[PDB]
């Protein structure tokens, strides 16, 4: 659904384990802010951003999938029609990285095959607590057909780069 004034509208979703930084990543990208305190989760919602790429004005409708679910019945409805995903883990939390394949399986189950994915090792500022080497993220991203970046919502490292790369690969696939 393209709004007047835009050339495209791409739905993007942030997915991954609880506490990897999804809500923070979206808050940094959309509002260029960070909250150093616990914020309550009250449900799934989106924020918008405009990107100018490939000579077009692109509206991004970017969905935060909110908290963990007991029954994965609500988040997964929003995967339908998504042009892209940020599949996020925390470089300081091994379990969040071990979960990547499960999230990737969900992408394939609930979204069309041409949905694009960037694997994001968030919290790259936490080098003192790193447990997931970037090379391990890159290897898995290559295995699964995803782009890859390390980033930090907290320090505003590679947040723009992640979204812009995702928009680029979406545009490339669209022109196949
Ligand atoms: N050190 C660090 N902490 C972060 C970063 N991004 C988010 N956090 C923190 O990680 C916790 C979980 O973030 P949140 O965005 O709520 O994660 P979500 O459960 O995936 O939505 C919060 O305490 C955030 O402040 C980051 O880039 N670096
Ligand atoms: Mg959240």
Alpha helix positions (H), the chain: 22-31, 94-98, 100-110, 134-144, 159-174
23 known member of a binding site: yes
Q: Which ligand 1 atom minimizes the distance to the CA of 151?
A: 27
Question: Is the Cβ–Cβ distance between 130 and 91 less than 8 Å?
Answer: yes
Q: Which residues contact 155 (CB under 8 A, 6 or more apart)?
A: 124, 125
Please give the Cα distance from 17 to 122 (Å, whole number): 12
Element (H, E) at 60: strand 56-64
125 is in an annotated binding site: yes
Contact 24, 16 (CB under 8 A): no
**How many angstroms separate the Cα of 173 from the Cα of each of 52, 62, 114?**
17, 19, 7
Of the candidates 101, 41, 30, 40, the one whose C-alpha atom is nearest the C-alpha of residue 65 is 41
Can you name the residues that pair with 117 across neighbouring β-strands? 85
Question: Is the sign of the CA dihedral 159, 162, 164, 166 positive or negative?
Answer: negative
Name the residue of 21, 62, 156 to mutate for ligand 1: max ligand atoms within 8 A of Cβ: 21
Please tell me what DSSP assigns to residue 114: T
Torsion sign over Cα 130, 134, 137, 143? negative
Q: Is 142 helix (H, G, I), strand (E, B) or coil?
A: helix
Task: Specify the number of domains making up the chain.
Answer: 1
CATH of the domain at 136: 3.40.50.300
Instruction: Calculate how far, in angstroms, residue 24's C-alpha sits from the geometric centre of ligand 2.
Output: 7
- 108 annotated ligand-binding residue: no
Sign of CA dihedral 131, 137, 139, 143: positive
Resolution to 1 decimal place, in Å: 1.5
């Amino acid at each position: 659904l393209v709004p007047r004034g835009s050339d495209y509208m791409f739905k993007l979703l942030l997915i991954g384990n609880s506490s990897v930084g999804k809500t923070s990543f979206l808050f940094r990208y959309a509002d260029d802010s960070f909250t150093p305190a616990f914020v309550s989760t009250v449900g799934i919602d989106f924020k918008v951003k405009t990107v100018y790429r490939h000579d077009k004005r692109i509206k991004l409708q970017i969905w935060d999938t909110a908290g963990q679910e007991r029954y994965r019945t609500i988040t997964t409805a929003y995967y339908r029609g998504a042009m892209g995903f940020l599949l996020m883990y925390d470089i300081a939390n091994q379990e969040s990285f071990a979960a990547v394949q499960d999230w990737a399986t969900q992408i394939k189950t609930y979204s069309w095959d041409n949905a694009q994915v960037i694997l994001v090792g968030n919290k790259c500022d936490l080098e003192d607590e790193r447990v997931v080497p970037a090379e391990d993220g890159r290897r898995l991203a290559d295995d699964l057909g995803f782009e890859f970046f390390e980033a930090s919502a907290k320090e505003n490292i590679n947040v723009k780069q992640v979204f812009e790369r995702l928009v680029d690969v979406i545009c490339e696939k669209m022109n196949e």
